[PDB]
Amino acid sequence: GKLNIVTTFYPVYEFTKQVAGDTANVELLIGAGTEPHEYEPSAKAVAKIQDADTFVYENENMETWVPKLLDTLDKKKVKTIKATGDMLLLPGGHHEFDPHVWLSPVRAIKLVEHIRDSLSADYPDKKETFEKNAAAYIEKLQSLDKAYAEGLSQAKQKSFVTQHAAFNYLALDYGLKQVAISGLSPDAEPSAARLAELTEYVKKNKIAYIYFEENASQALANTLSKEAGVKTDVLNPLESLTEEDTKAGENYISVMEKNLKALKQTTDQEGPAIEPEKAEDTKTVQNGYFEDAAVKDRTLSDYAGNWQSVYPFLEDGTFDQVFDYKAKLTGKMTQAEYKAYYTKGYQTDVTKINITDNTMEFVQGGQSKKYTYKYVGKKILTYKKGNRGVRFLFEATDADAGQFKYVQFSDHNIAPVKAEHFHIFFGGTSQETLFEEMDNWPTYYPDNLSGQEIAQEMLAH
Ligand SMILES: [Cl-]
Ligand SMILES: [Zn+2]
Ligand SMILES: [Zn+2]
């Protein structure tokens, strides 16, 4: 009969139904009346998932209860699908990363593609149906992407204030700037103190709208207008669709069309950029802001382990999303320019480095050269930005060390601690010549990681 597919919340349900069509009965586990971020599965819910043919969830950074279920699910017959597939995430403002990729139409295409791919692998006899259904829905998503680009590319004012911070990927992919606001709910009146803070914030930044995940209550809208001097509207994160909206034919695409209209009320109006209510402090040791007194000698054992070059994962495309993000975050280089920059940086024929308390072993061409190393000191460099970094210096004790005679590690630390990754400068001339090297910095992560894991780790912090 039809596949019994259990999905978690609304966009996972919709995207899965679009791909599976009449091959499946697709169930929505989290009903519209429950906020998906707050959902916790009951024993009955877990049973329903365990007994399904296929279970689809969006991402462990959204359905934070899914990781604990997978250890047992992996032993049951149900085939699981993580909708985001190999999509890399950025940190949010428990879970490490912001899951809200489906509010970017171009990313929604990638989730639909991945659901197609996984269902096609899981049920090969239906692959032509999945592929056909997916392609037709992707056509509609492509038109949505075009509407987004056309409606946002000429934005005069790129920043928008949202009570639900679901729109950072939309912002990155279409040239806007999400400004999340805290301590607000569509159905609740703020405290006197919070309202005063909001009134000052609106005035300081000339904020025209506060956007909410659903319509603000009549009372809250009135209060924000008469006391805080700001209008309200809806930026719907498409996490829930009411039965009323379902029966009126609303869906992901129509919600996103409404979101575009709502955004443009802000983005097509002149005005100053809106600052976050509380400012960031990026001046940290790992970002290169530290005091001389905290810089300490280190031993080779901080770097002990087995380490793999990241260069093959640039070459094979695994890091293409990293360079896409960098371009969208800074605007300073294009994606291709960033990839070229990191090609020069990562290029090396040293595929692996094994490090002990006293030795380093360098693998080139499937053969290894191993030397004993002594610590020789450290060097604090200052960069254009005004931040600094510490190189920790080692020298091989073998006459035959060649290009590995001199070795310097950079790992964003300044004192004893186990490295999580490093950039390594090595040569056979002197330490001083390596201090001037700024273009090539072969980069290593633990051998126990996949390239995909390295790529996601690069975006963390
Ligand atoms: Cl780095
Ligand atoms: Zn959300
Ligand atoms: Zn680094």
Author numbering: 27 to 119, 134 to 501
Sentences from the paper on this structure:
Zinc is essential for virulence and survival and is acquired solely by the ABC transporter, AdcCB, and two Zn2+-specific cluster A-I SBPs, AdcA and AdcAII, in S. pneumoniae. Although both SBPs share this structural core, AdcA also has a C-terminal domain (residues 322 to 501; here termed AdcAC) that is structurally related to ZinT, a periplasmic protein from E. coli and Salmonella. The AdcAC domain is linked to the N-terminal cluster A-I domain of AdcA (residues 1 to 311, henceforth referred to as AdcAN) by an 11-amino-acid linking region.
The AdcAN domain has a two-lobed organization, with the N- and C-terminal (α/β)4 lobes bisected by a cleft in which the metal binds. The binding site in AdcAN is comprised of three Nε2 atoms from His63, His140, and His204 and one Oε2 atom from Glu279. Intriguingly, the AdcAN domain was observed in a conformation that partially exposed the metal-binding site to bulk solvent, with the relative solvent accessibility of the metal-binding residues (His63 > His140 > His204 ≈ Glu279) remaining the same during the five independent MD simulations. In Zn2+-bound AdcA, interaction between the domains occurs between α12 and α15 of the AdcAC domain and α7 and the base portion of the His-rich loop (residues 109 to 117) of the AdcAN domain, with a buried surface area of ∼1,200 Å2. The most stable part of the interface involves the salt bridge between Lys368 and Asp213 and H-bonds formed by the side chain of Tyr365 with the backbone and side chain of Asp213 and the backbone of Leu212.
